[PDB]
Design a protein around this ligand. Structure first.
Ligand SMILES: *[C@@H]1O[C@H](CO)[C@@H](O[C@@H]2O[C@H](CO)[C@@H](O[C@@H]3O[C@H](CO[C@H]4O[C@H](CO[C@H]5O[C@H](CO)[C@@H](O)[C@H](O)[C@@H]5O[C@H]5O[C@H](CO)[C@@H](O)[C@H](O)[C@@H]5O)[C@@H](O)[C@H](O[C@H]5O[C@H](CO)[C@@H](O)[C@H](O)[C@@H]5O[C@H]5O[C@H](CO)[C@@H](O)[C@H](O)[C@@H]5O)[C@@H]4O)[C@@H](O)[C@H](O[C@H]4O[C@H](CO)[C@@H](O)[C@H](O)[C@@H]4O)[C@@H]3O)[C@H](O)[C@H]2NC(C)=O)[C@H](O)[C@H]1NC(C)=O
Ligand SMILES: *[C@@H]1O[C@H](CO)[C@@H](O[C@@H]2O[C@H](CO)[C@@H](O[C@@H]3O[C@H](CO[C@H]4O[C@H](CO[C@H]5O[C@H](CO)[C@@H](O)[C@H](O)[C@@H]5O)[C@@H](O)[C@H](O[C@H]5O[C@H](CO)[C@@H](O)[C@H](O)[C@@H]5O)[C@@H]4O)[C@@H](O)[C@H](O[C@H]4O[C@H](CO)[C@@H](O)[C@H](O)[C@@H]4O[C@H]4O[C@H](CO)[C@@H](O)[C@H](O)[C@@H]4O)[C@@H]3O)[C@H](O)[C@H]2NC(C)=O)[C@H](O)[C@H]1NC(C)=O
Ligand SMILES: *[C@@H]1O[C@H](CO)[C@@H](O[C@@H]2O[C@H](CO)[C@@H](O[C@@H]3O[C@H](CO)[C@@H](O)[C@H](O[C@H]4O[C@H](CO)[C@@H](O)[C@H](O)[C@@H]4O)[C@@H]3O)[C@H](O)[C@H]2NC(C)=O)[C@H](O)[C@H]1NC(C)=O
Ligand SMILES: *[C@@H]1O[C@H](CO)[C@@H](O)[C@H](O)[C@H]1NC(C)=O
Ligand SMILES: [Mg+2]
Length: 318
């Protein structure tokens, strides 16, 4: 109280994507784990619970990576989000050639085995069961499950997740759904249905934003999901800019983080937390995905806070 993100956010959590290779780099880069403990009280595994890592061959599970992030989280009594179970990317190659009932059987076994493991071992607050199931124009993404099983795979996946009987909230997660547009409309219609049918609890908004270009009706869109009766969370926040960073963009980034915080706070108890997709710019996915862009997180390459850090603290407290 009130100098850290985690303190300022209470009773909401303020989390970070944590990668196993950075956590285990404590010797050479202690500030990563130190900043995690001092500033954050939520965590999402960056990669190692994804299908390609956790079930690399059929019915052969590898929990090592997920267990490391979960244990770090448990030691610090973080809010832990499981991420993710059904997603067209970072999918083990053997899945992509399965057809029909065979594909569905593999998927049921994936969801059930992974969730049962973490039910018995750790406290998972929420699971991103299905990730990125829609296209920008509001149609269903034609991934392998859609192609083989049709649109019903989405509620069926939540049905399977429910049958594990964990105390985890079940979330659906996506990007470009943060404003009011075709994609968020489509997501909302499906969420309204699934919520009616007791299948989903939460909606995750990734919020991979570009500085000074946030969605115009961010808060209003959050509000209509909350009106549908789900909780929401900001799940993968970063706000990127062109490098080297201009003074104007650094200042605007501060305003943009505050804008996201305020859109969350406006929902009261229904918005449970904010997670940034990483801790420091030094390991951000952005400069390797968008060359010449970066400076997107709250701490720079030397773990010195951005001006956005102060703006986030102030918005959380106010
Ligand atoms: C289930 O899921 C699991 C979890 O995901 C999977 O397990 C993970 O699998 C991945 C992929 O294979 C693996 O990542 C790779 O690891 C490679 C091994 O690196 C480690 O070991 C080497 C070698 O250590 C030996 O030698 C040193 C000294 O030379 C000694 O100190 C060691 O104790 C050890 O000695 C013993 O063995 C030798 C013979 O090997 C004997 O001669 C000796 O007598 C001893 O018996 C180390 O050098 C590495 O150390 C680095 O990282 C650790 C952190 O864990 C640091 O503490 C350490 O200081 C050092 O850090 C430096 O390197 C890192 C990058 O590695 C830098 O970031 C950092 O700045 C430092 O410079 C490890 O301990 C590794 O080689 C490989 O590297 C990749 O990147 C390089 C670029 O450098 C590329 O060129 C390569 O191609 C690779 O892509 C990569 O990181 C994970 O380690 C592994 N486990 C975990 C927990 O994630 C599992 O496979 C899966 N199972 C399935 C699917 O079945
Ligand atoms: C575990 O912890 C360790 C820390 O102990 C982590 O290692 C560090 O990892 C970071 C992130 O990858 C690296 O930062 C990057 O550095 C490169 C340049 O690196 C070269 O130059 C370094 C500086 O060299 C001078 O200065 C030193 C002393 O300061 C002198 O000793 C030298 O002689 C030079 O005068 C040098 O230190 C580097 O180290 C190399 O040394 C060993 C041998 O010792 C070599 O074998 C290795 O190859 C090792 O690299 C190296 O020579 C920068 O270019 C990077 O900046 C880009 O990326 C940033 C984000 O990552 C971004 O903010 C920047 O703006 C910039 O991005 C821009 O440019 C990109 C070009 O690629 C564009 O793609 C992009 O879009 C954008 O436009 C970055 O700063 C550290 O070098 C590294 N430190 C060490 C000591 O290794 C390690 O990663 C951790 N591991 C895990 C798993 O967490
Ligand atoms: C809204 O935008 C979406 C996304 O841009 C767009 O959806 C795309 O539609 C086209 C067809 O109009 C899909 O193209 C393919 O058509 C062939 C048949 O010729 C199918 O075999 C494809 O199936 C996929 O699966 C194959 C394995 O069996 C793979 O080879 C590959 O993954 C194929 O894509 C597929 O139906 C295209 O896949 C989709 N894209 C996505 C992301 O869903 C849609 O047309 C737009 N609607 C509008 C503008 O009204
Ligand atoms: C998406 O926008 C287009 C305009 O190009 C519109 O015709 C269509 O009805 C919209 N889709 C949905 C699902 O609202
Ligand atoms: Mg706990």
């Amino acid at each position: 109280p009130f100098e850290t993100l985690r303190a300022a956010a209470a009773p909401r959590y303020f989390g970070a994507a944590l990668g196993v290779p950075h956590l285990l780099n404590f010797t050479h880069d202690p500030l990563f784990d130190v900043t995690a403990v001092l500033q954050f009280n939520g965590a999402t595994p960056e990669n190692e619970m994804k299908w390609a890592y956790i079930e690399p061959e059929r019915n052969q599970f590898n929990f090592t990576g997920g267990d490391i992030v979960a244990a770090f989280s448990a030691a610090n009594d973080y809010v832990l989000r499981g991420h993710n179970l059904v997603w067209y990317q970072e999918l083990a190659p053997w899945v992509e050639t399965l057809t029909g009932e065979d594909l569905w059987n593999a998927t049921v076994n994936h969801i059930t085995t992974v969730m049962t493991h973490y039910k018995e071992s750790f406290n998972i607050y929420a699971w991103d069961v299905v990730n990125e199931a829609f296209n920008d124009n509001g149609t269903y993404r034609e991934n392998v499950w859609y192609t083989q099983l049709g649109p019903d795979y989405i509620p069926n996946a939540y049905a399977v997740a429910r049958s594990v009987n964990t105390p985890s909230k079940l979330y659906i997660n996506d990007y470009n759904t943060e404003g009011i547009n075709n994609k968020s409309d489509a997501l909302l219609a499906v969420v309204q249905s699934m919520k009616a049918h007791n299948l989903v609890d939460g909606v995750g908004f990734q919020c991979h934003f570009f500085v000074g270009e946030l969605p115009p009706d961010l808060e209003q869109n959050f509000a209509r999901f909350v009106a549908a009766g789900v909780e929401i969370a900001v799940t993968e926040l970063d706000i990127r800019m062109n490098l080297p960073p201009s003074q104007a963009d650094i200042e605007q980034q501060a305003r943009d983080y505050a804008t996201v915080v305020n859109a969350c706070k406006a929902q009261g108890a229904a918005c449970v937390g904010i997670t940034t997709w990483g801790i420091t710019d030094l390991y951000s996915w952005i400069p390797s995905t968008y060359p010449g862009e970066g400076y997107a997180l709250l701490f720079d390459d030397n773990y010195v806070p951005h001006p956005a850090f102060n703006a986030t603290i102030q918005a959380l407290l106010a």
